[PDB]
Design a protein around this ligand. Sequence first.
Ligand SMILES: Nc1ncnc2c1ncn2[C@@H]1O[C@H](COP(=O)(O)OP(=O)(O)O)[C@@H](O)[C@H]1O
Length: 350
Amino acid sequence: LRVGRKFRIGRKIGDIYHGTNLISGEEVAIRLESIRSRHPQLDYESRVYKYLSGGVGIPFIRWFGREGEYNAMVIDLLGPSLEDLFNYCHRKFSFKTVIMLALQMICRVQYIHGRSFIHRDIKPDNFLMGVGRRGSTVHVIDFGLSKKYRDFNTHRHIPYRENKSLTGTARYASVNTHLGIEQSRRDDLESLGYMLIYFCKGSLPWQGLKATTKKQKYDRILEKKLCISVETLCAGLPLEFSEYMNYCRNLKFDERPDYLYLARLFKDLSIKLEYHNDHLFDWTMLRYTKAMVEKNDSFNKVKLLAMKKFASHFHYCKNDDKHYPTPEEIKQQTVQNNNAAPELLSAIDK
Ligand SMILES: Nc1ncnc2c1ncn2[C@@H]1O[C@H](COP(=O)(O)OP(=O)(O)O)[C@@H](O)[C@H]1O
């Protein structure tokens, strides 16, 4: 079970495994693919990782190639995905966490696009926090569906094309992806927009649909994405979220996104909400509070204490809201958070 010269395959995670550099003892991750795969992808994915190497929050690939009857890829060991953490937090994130996530993910996408690639599978499962002290950094994974959208030298954009079949995940797919249009930079950013809204509101209104065929499900999703107003979609969110969505839906096919303009939506908002970009995420504070306590109902209790102790960090979308709340309206929740409630309030101060 040796890979390259110095890496040993350990337990499954997991065709991805824990691994170990035998010289240094560093824990890594190791992805295997059979050379009898009908649809090889790992060599392509390795090569994209390698071309993207050096960008912030891009997993660093340590080794890749053929080993025995496997293609193998040795890469940084990362932590939980955003979908895992979303579940850990019972499927809603605070505005602060979504903002801090948005700021990092926009930079990740900007970096990838600046290397002439589009990801094409932007979704919560494909962003992981680092392990340990790197838990503060959002990383991007799974480049198997990525694609070069312009020439490396001339920056000549790939041609406008129609009739493409949907790839990959319908829930976060852009409207133009549903319509069969060649994906480009705008579509990565639109998907990231659906994620942000999903994180804030707890769901997207086209989840849980059923149909008689694959195509019919996709089209029922498309109709909701097309026919729902941005106001309904973004109900209860500060205006920045609908402006982000409106911006992505208006980008032309070959158009260079103004990434700084989009980052400024969230950075300017963070300042108005009095959030420091301190990488203190919802899970970080929930996990910490539970640690102190232990010295679904149980979670609700931990959460109540966390939101009391960290009253100015935990502001949530109210899904009954029909309007976009102002920052002052959102910050009223700090007062409510401190107004909640003996031996437990004592332990929390401690
Ligand atoms: N570099 C990495 N370090 C640690 N875990 C990873 C890494 N890359 C992917 N994972 C995790 O390994 C698990 C198995 O991944 P995989 O089965 O390929 O994803 P999926 O089940 O969505 O197809 C996932 O939970 C994913 O978050």
